[PDB]
Design an enzyme around this catalytic site. Structure first.
Site, short mmCIF file in Angstrom:
data_model
loop_
_atom_site.label_atom_id
_atom_site.label_comp_id
_atom_site.label_asym_id
_atom_site.label_seq_id
_atom_site.Cartn_x
_atom_site.Cartn_y
_atom_site.Cartn_z
N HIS A 351 0.84 -1.19 0.06
CA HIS A 351 0.28 -0.02 -0.15
C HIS A 351 0.80 1.35 -0.11
O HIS A 351 0.30 2.31 0.07
CB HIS A 351 -0.80 -0.06 1.27
CG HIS A 351 -2.07 -1.03 1.07
ND1 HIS A 351 -3.30 -0.72 0.41
CD2 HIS A 351 -2.17 -2.24 1.72
CE1 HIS A 351 -3.93 -1.90 0.62
NE2 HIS A 351 -3.31 -2.78 1.12
N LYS A 542 -8.78 14.13 3.60
CA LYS A 542 -7.84 12.93 3.55
C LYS A 542 -7.05 13.01 4.98
O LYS A 542 -6.87 14.31 5.55
CB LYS A 542 -7.05 12.69 2.32
CG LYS A 542 -6.16 14.29 2.12
CD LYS A 542 -6.13 14.48 0.65
CE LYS A 542 -5.67 13.25 -0.08
NZ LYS A 542 -6.65 13.07 -1.36
N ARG A 543 -6.36 12.20 5.34
CA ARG A 543 -5.45 12.33 6.41
C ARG A 543 -4.29 13.52 6.11
O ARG A 543 -3.73 13.74 4.89
CB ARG A 543 -4.68 10.92 6.68
CG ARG A 543 -5.47 10.07 7.34
CD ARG A 543 -6.03 10.44 8.91
NE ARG A 543 -4.83 10.50 9.67
CZ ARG A 543 -4.65 9.59 10.75
NH1 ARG A 543 -5.44 8.49 10.87
NH2 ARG A 543 -3.66 9.78 11.65
N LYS A 548 0.76 14.44 0.84
CA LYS A 548 -0.40 14.77 0.32
C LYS A 548 -0.86 16.21 0.11
O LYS A 548 -1.89 16.66 -0.73
CB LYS A 548 -1.68 14.32 1.08
CG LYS A 548 -1.63 12.74 1.50
CD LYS A 548 -2.80 12.43 2.40
CE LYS A 548 -2.80 11.01 2.81
NZ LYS A 548 -3.66 10.16 1.54
N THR A 650 -8.32 6.66 -2.98
CA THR A 650 -9.71 6.12 -2.97
C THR A 650 -10.71 7.17 -2.83
O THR A 650 -11.62 7.24 -3.46
CB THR A 650 -9.88 4.98 -2.25
OG1 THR A 650 -9.55 5.33 -0.69
CG2 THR A 650 -9.20 3.75 -2.40
N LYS A 654 -14.23 8.42 -4.93
CA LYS A 654 -15.39 8.72 -4.63
C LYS A 654 -16.07 9.91 -4.94
O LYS A 654 -17.32 10.27 -5.48
CB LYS A 654 -15.16 8.95 -2.92
CG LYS A 654 -14.81 7.56 -2.33
CD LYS A 654 -14.63 7.94 -0.74
CE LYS A 654 -13.45 6.59 -0.24
NZ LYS A 654 -13.33 6.99 1.10
O1 LIG Z 1 -2.98 1.33 7.77
N1 LIG Z 1 -2.44 2.43 8.24
O2 LIG Z 1 -2.86 3.61 8.20
C1 LIG Z 1 -1.10 2.24 8.91
C2 LIG Z 1 -0.85 2.23 10.08
C3 LIG Z 1 0.26 1.97 10.84
C4 LIG Z 1 1.31 2.08 9.89
C5 LIG Z 1 1.48 2.07 8.63
C6 LIG Z 1 0.07 2.47 7.88
C7 LIG Z 1 0.00 2.35 6.41
N2 LIG Z 1 -0.82 2.89 5.88
N3 LIG Z 1 -1.03 2.81 4.59
C8 LIG Z 1 -2.09 3.24 3.91
S1 LIG Z 1 -3.33 4.12 4.72
N4 LIG Z 1 -1.77 3.44 2.56
C9 LIG Z 1 -2.81 3.74 1.54
O3 LIG Z 1 -3.64 2.91 1.10
C10 LIG Z 1 -4.70 3.04 0.31
C11 LIG Z 1 -5.60 1.87 0.05
O4 LIG Z 1 -4.71 1.01 -0.95
C12 LIG Z 1 -3.98 3.76 -0.88
O5 LIG Z 1 -5.08 4.37 -1.85
C13 LIG Z 1 -3.22 5.06 -0.54
O6 LIG Z 1 -2.47 5.64 -1.76
C14 LIG Z 1 -2.00 4.64 0.71
O7 LIG Z 1 -1.57 5.72 1.04
#
Ligand SMILES: O=[N+]([O-])c1ccccc1/C=N/NC(=S)N[C@@H]1O[C@H](CO)[C@@H](O)[C@H](O)[C@H]1O
Ligand SMILES: O=[N+]([O-])c1ccccc1/C=N/NC(=S)N[C@@H]1O[C@H](CO)[C@@H](O)[C@H](O)[C@H]1O
Ligand SMILES: O=[N+]([O-])c1ccccc1/C=N/NC(=S)N[C@@H]1O[C@H](CO)[C@@H](O)[C@H](O)[C@H]1O
Ligand SMILES: O=[N+]([O-])c1ccccc1/C=N/NC(=S)N[C@@H]1O[C@H](CO)[C@@H](O)[C@H](O)[C@H]1O
Lengths: 810, 810
Positions: A351, A542-543, A548, A650, A654
């Site tokens: 991811h 978004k976060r 970003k 994503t 939306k």
């Molecule tokens: O899931 N997390 O929020 C988390 C918690 C602790 C350590 C790493 C992470 C990594 N998060 N990674 C994330 S949210 N990646 C996100 O995944 C989405 C779904 O495929 C993509 O659309 C985004 O481009 C990507 O940044």
């Protein structure tokens, strides 16, 4: 009221009403004279919930008889949002319940607002899991979501004096009508201890035991009578735990802390023991459950024919050595056969490419916590590296680059390398992301085993993300092309023949205006803010992350303000600029960005020369339920990450589905979205991945842009001098210095082209008819971005199962 | 099957069966093919529970309209046991459910065994609260029980190598169908902080807040459609608690630890901060709830006309200064009026004379934890001592004896003195106990305010303690005199005219033999032990304490063994000697006594010369549900505390109601029991209170008894030398030395007369017909010991309310 919300038949409404009253009396123990809206919400939730149970029991009965291959989707995050409306939609009960509650003298919408979000994720990755579960059920796959039932999900965000404050998300306070506790299926999980070598293999002994108690949540498919299961584990101490007396009982919380709270980092790794415990807990309990279910169908050759395990990032990567542990130590299979079984069972989805987000666990942690798993990992590494040596003889640097074991100050395990070695498929989440994986960070692995590497472009569920949050749009669409597109989003292409249809153009624009009006009123009611619903709704939600580039948006906003102050009596398209999102609690720069946004608002929103021509609003506590409100209301979607950093995104999908136009870089899924709609129908600006590379090789010098762009210089000078913080002139010095001297994401490099592209957006909005025709071309080509498409590709190309649109008997 | 268990009508059985299936499907989410006995228990509990709700809502509705005076029974303990059977009995559903479940192919008794005990108390005081709630509902009083919902109740007792082991009582693991969470009625409780003095009085500021969340449990009266409420508070941290981020969330457990675990001390004070927090928590939340309910009927003159607060021992004594705090600081009443209101509202029940059991809180604890309460206490003390000075001028020693403040190394607050000063009634719990209060420990208070002092002899509920646990006896009784005695136990006197009735004699003895057979089989099934059901069942069940003299029983047991070994071929009445009970975890001597009992069993039970003539069994995990089994099976009840130490006892009453004869001292309620039945019908032995006094004045010398009684000398020599512990000869040296040099309870002084009295018991048991006639005379005169009688006296003489036997509409 509206067609897509189902029938409101006399028999059904009567039935719902009496079941509502039955629950109010017997379940809630209340009468109509003391009941609050919260009680009414609960009576409704229980009434709707009853419709799930029969279907839930027979779905799981069906899987037992037919014995299909089972899909296990392992994630530490499931960002579910609310469940009531989603259940009504998928069961075709929405109009019936609307009628029933109306006749009881109740407003269903008001009751819907009472439900807490299940906030068991951070953002994109967590919400992807939730969309995936919905699509898997809709496509008739025997799928199970497995995670952790956090007592506290993502924190609630309060803004106080322009700063983010966090407070505990006590989402279970009033109880969760949607979960069923299953204490009878509790399983032991082991920690610490040591490895003993005997006549017949290793044994892991003197362990501490934590109990894993499951809670099941139903996942209904769209109108097909399929109800799948999401099983979330909760940590419980055994009864003889620490067993002066009083302290021993109180120390039970030490074990139960495992499932207490979600780690609130988005795209960022923090190497804490508690986090590792969480990762093993979910994997260990889940794998026992899988093996139990497989045995109740000796011969583990058929295991990969009956089981697929999907790893959602590296967070559940310990499934690989845990499956090895179980097969080798407990079932007594030989290593080579066990390994073959593991590889064929496991698949890994990446991811992110951001280095600080990658999990690299210190060896001394795994040594203390999971001593047998470390030995298995070393053994995996040795056998893997012998394959590399044999394929690329004498390439000694390749050996150190590919090792699962990293050398240095502290030795670490690279969990991503573990996942690739132990999986038959590795996929990225958008075409450009998957290509980047093959060319850069996983190049060596791709050269060794090219067949492993795949793409599966992300998607979103059109149930939650159109029908549920935007009934008005769903309805005008269904009037022209029918209802079939809801589970076959490709049918939206048929809307292209309506792009010159004057009735449709009017209807599409009318739906947006109504969403904007409803959202503008929501903002007044709950947050006392005055916005103009005729302005362009410019939204970035978004976060909060540097990659970003909310900061790039901030620079545009200030530029617009400065241009107005320069020529006050000149006409500009009015804008409401909305930015929302949570910052990780330890992320200082992200918290500074939030403060900057509110500070800008404080100046812009109170300047009488500006009037209602420019407003800057920070949308507090952005979450799934807020997304369902703001996305339908947006005109402009901001998708402006530095090229090569956003794996997919994503949120972008939306907005496309809901009638916003997109301003964005050629990053992540934006590339495929513009390819589907046509580049003429997209506001693309900025460096491509190739341009970023060229700039890195030469050296990125921010001062150059500052020197050559007077408008940019002015903003930096305003920031440095205290224009946006009169009482603390130096408040934003960290931001300025980062922008000037250590900007990893090249905000200045895209500024000029961004501002220019933003002018072109404004020009198009001046012509309502042509704006709307471009919108129709976006909505009409958004079909690819349904998670039904994504899941069908996982099913066919990774899991080896065929989806099915066929109903189960009601 | 049997008459007293109600009707099994066709309409009712059909209805129960379909509701059972409805709950199994919709509530449990199961079908008949996967359901376990536990699932069946839950479907039954929910089905029965539904019958409560209508009655529960209308009872509470009725109280709102009629606005009667409300009774608040404040206790830290409610030892409830199981609820399913009790509910069936009080709702007259037992036969109907028995039939319904039979027709479903289920055994109801087997389903009853699945329910966990609500073990929220230690022993007598906790079980008294539970019997009281039952009687208050049966008598139509507007009564509320208030306590704490402990997550862990009294520990489960395991015996391992003859030693007690404690394990956590995780009674909520599978959920509690009987409680309703009421998060909407959550209330704040304050801790720590400091006192600020302003223009208008004191203010308590900078406090830490803990939330009190209520859980309501229904309390049905006997066949009168009254359902009262027991409200138990649970501790919850506020959402901004401690609000790095992760730790702050994890530290929420610090606040929630308040309701985590029951302190497991019986008749013993431990001055721990956590215990004090528990005491304030229950009082603070309860009082806000009372005041809220009173206001929703300005004028606190009517407060004592609408509210009674009963304090169950000194554990909720902080209600006195808390009511003062609220009235003075918050409602702004003047001191004198507030005080008058408090005294008239509060009443205090004393449960013990043992000095180590009395609560004396260190001043430095109250100072830190409850600074305003300490100031109010000092002010109460000063005004109280001025009254004493004016009544007994110049009596300076009386001033220091009566002070609420005790001087010395650490200053302490005497909570008992607080309760007497702040209450309009003080009562002991049996006539001799109440007399002892007036003559000894509260003499000075009695001389100042004689009108305050009352007696209310304890009682037990004949619903749980006859109809529920001994249906066979209840049935043969009802055959002769009808069913009316169940809520008017005095009618049992009519059984005196059956004492020469040959049919009755046979029936009474037949019921006992069947109870003994059922219990003997229970012992084999669950604990693999071989007992002779023809032997005399000699039972002592109660908490392990030195004052209760389980050790005196042990001495008798060894004497019987030694006499057998001396003359093996001589005939002795066979006995099964059963001793059971829990020891407080920190109570070393109590744990040694348990080990002694098992050690004696180890020798006695395996000696082939003894045969089945003498067995010694330790009944593991004694609790309410075990009491319901063993009490109906007993022939001989052991009630052998040193005269003046057992305030009342309630176990004694249970045995009397169920056809055991009593061997006991003239202590507690034993005196009134023998007075009711006739002394000829009771096995009374030992020193009276007067004899104990005489012995103390002279000096108790244990060596004297040892020197003059050869049989006693032999036992001590057997204990010292290692006869009962061959591998560790010195194991019992602590016991021997206590008996010889520091016995507070004069075990040796009663030994001779005890042994003698035990011979007379054996002689009577040799003649079945005369044994049974004496039993009938006991059962027939046990009516006084119904808690319906006790509660009617509280109602009339303390609370100022009239009981009522009248039905509410169904
Ligand atoms: O899931 N997390 O929020 C988390 C918690 C602790 C350590 C790493 C992470 C990594 N998060 N990674 C994330 S949210 N990646 C996100 O995944 C989405 C779904 O495929 C993509 O659309 C985004 O481009 C990507 O940044
Ligand atoms: O998970 N669900 O959405 C769902 C659908 C239909 C019926 C129940 C549920 C969930 N129930 N979850 C729980 S914890 N139910 C509990 O079941 C207990 C006995 O097992 C009962 O004591 C309680 O009344 C009930 O809350
Ligand atoms: O206290 N009771 O014995 C009793 C009698 C009749 C019905 C319910 C109860 C107790 N219910 N207690 C609880 S926690 N019920 C809960 O109510 C929740 C909504 O408020 C639901 O989500 C749950 O299904 C239910 O377990
Ligand atoms: O309630 N407790 O078990 C407790 C916990 C912590 C500190 C003191 C105590 C005091 N317990 N006192 C008890 S059980 N007294 C008991 O109360 C019964 C009911 O009136 C009487 O029949 C008994 O004679 C008396 O000993």
């Amino acid at each position: 009221q509206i067609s897509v919300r189902g029938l409101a038949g006399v028999e059904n409404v009567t039935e719902l009403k009496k079941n509502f009253n039955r629950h109010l009396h017997f379940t809630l123990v209340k009468d109509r004279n003391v009941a609050t809206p919260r009680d009414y919400y609960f009576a409704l939730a229980h009434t709707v919930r009853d419709h799930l149970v029969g279907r839930w029991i027979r779905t799981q009965q069906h899987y037992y008889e037919k014995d299909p291959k089972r899909i296990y989707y392992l994630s530490l995050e499931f960002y579910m949002g609310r469940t009531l409306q989603n259940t009504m939609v998928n069961l075709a009960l929405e109009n019936a319940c609307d009628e029933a509650t109306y006749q009881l003298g109740l407003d269903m919408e008001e009751l819907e607002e009472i439900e807490e979000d299940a906030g068991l994720g951070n953002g994109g990755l967590g919400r992807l899991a939730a969309c995936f579960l919905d699509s898997m059920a809709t496509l008739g796959l025997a799928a199970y979501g497995y995670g952790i039932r956090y007592e506290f999900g993502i924190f609630n965000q309060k803004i106080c004096g322009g700063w983010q404050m966090e407070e505990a998300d006590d989402w279970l306070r009033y109880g969760n009508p949607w979960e069923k506790a299953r204490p009878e299926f509790t399983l032991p999980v082991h920690f610490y201890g040591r490895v003993e070598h005997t006549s017949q293999g290793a044994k892991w002994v003197d362990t501490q035991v934590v109990l894993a108690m499951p809670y099941d949540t139903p996942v209904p498919g769209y109108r097909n009578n399929v109800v799948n299961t999401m099983r979330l584990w909760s940590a419980k101490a055994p009864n003889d735990f620490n067993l002066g007396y009083i302290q021993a009982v109180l120390d039970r919380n030490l074990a139960e802390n495992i499932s207490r709270v979600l780690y609130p980092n988005d795209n960022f790794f923090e190497g804490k023991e508690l986090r590792l415990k969480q990762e093993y807990f979910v994997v260990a309990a889940t794998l026992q459950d899988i093996i139990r279910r497989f045995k109740s169908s000796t011969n583990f050759d058929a295991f990969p024919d009956k089981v697929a395990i999907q790893l959602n990032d590296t967070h559940p990567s310990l499934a690989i050595p845990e499956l090895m542990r179980v097969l080798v130590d407990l079932e007594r299979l030989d290593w080579d056969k066990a390994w073959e079984v593991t590889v064929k069972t496991c698949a890994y989805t990446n991811h992110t490419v951001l280095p600080e987000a990658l999990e690299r666990w210190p060896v001394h942690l795994l040594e203390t916590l999971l001593p047998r798993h470390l030995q298995i990992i070393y053994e995996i590494n040795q056998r893997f590296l012998n394959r590399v040596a044999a394929a690329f003889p004498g390439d000694v640097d390749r050996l150190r680059r590919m090792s699962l074991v990293e050398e240095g100050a502290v030795k670490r395990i690279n969990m991503a390398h573990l996942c690739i070695a132990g999986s038959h498929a590795v996929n990225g989440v958008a075409r450009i992301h998957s290509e980047i994986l093959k060319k850069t960070i996983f190049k060596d692995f791709y050269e060794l085993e090219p067949h492993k590497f795949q793409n599966k472009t992300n998607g979103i569920t059109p149930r939650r993300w159109l029908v549920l949050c935007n009934p008005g749009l769903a309805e005008i669409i269904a009037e022209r092309i029918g209802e079939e597109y809801i589970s076959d989003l490709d049918q939206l292409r048929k809307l292209l023949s309506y792009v010159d249809d004057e009735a449709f153009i009017r209807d599409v624009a009318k739906v947006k205006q109504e969403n904007k009006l409803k959202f503008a009123a929501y903002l007044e009611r709950e947050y006392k803010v005055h916005i103009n619903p005729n302005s362009l709704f410019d939204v970035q939600v978004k976060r909060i992350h540097e990659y970003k580039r909310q900061l790039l948006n901030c620079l545009h906003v200030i530029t617009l303000y400065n241009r107005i102050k320069k020529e006050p009596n000149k006409f500009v398209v009015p804008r409401t600029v909305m930015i929302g999102g949570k910052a990780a609690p330890g992320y200082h720069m992200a918290k500074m960005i939030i403060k900057l946004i509110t500070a800008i608002g404080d100046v812009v929103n109170h300047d009488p020369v500006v009037g209602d021509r420019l407003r800057v609003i920070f949308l507090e506590n952005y979450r799934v339920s807020l997304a369902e409100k703001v996305i339908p209301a947006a005109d402009l979607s901001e998708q402006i990450s530095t090229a090569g950093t956003e794996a997919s995104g994503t949120g972008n999908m939306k907005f496309m589905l809901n009638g916003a136009l997109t301003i964005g870089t050629m990053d992540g899924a934006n590339v495929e979205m513009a390819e589907e709609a046509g580049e003429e129908n997209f506001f693309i600006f900025g460096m491509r991945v190739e341009d970023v590379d060229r700039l890195d090789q030469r050296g990125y010098n921010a001062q150059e842009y500052y020197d050559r762009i007077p408008e940019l210089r002015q903003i930096i000078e305003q920031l440095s001098s205290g224009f946006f913080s009169p009482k603390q002139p130096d408040l934003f010095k960290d931001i300025v210095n980062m922008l000037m001297h250590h900007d990893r994401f090249k905000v200045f490099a895209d500024y000029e082209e961004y501002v220019k592209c933003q002018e072109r957006v404004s020009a198009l909005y001046k012509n309502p008819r042509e704006w709307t025709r471009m919108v129709i071309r976006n909505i009409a080509t958004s079909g690819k971005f349904s998670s039904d498409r994504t899941i069908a590709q996982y099913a066919r190309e990774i899991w080896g199962v065929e989806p099915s649109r066929q109903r189960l008997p009601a």
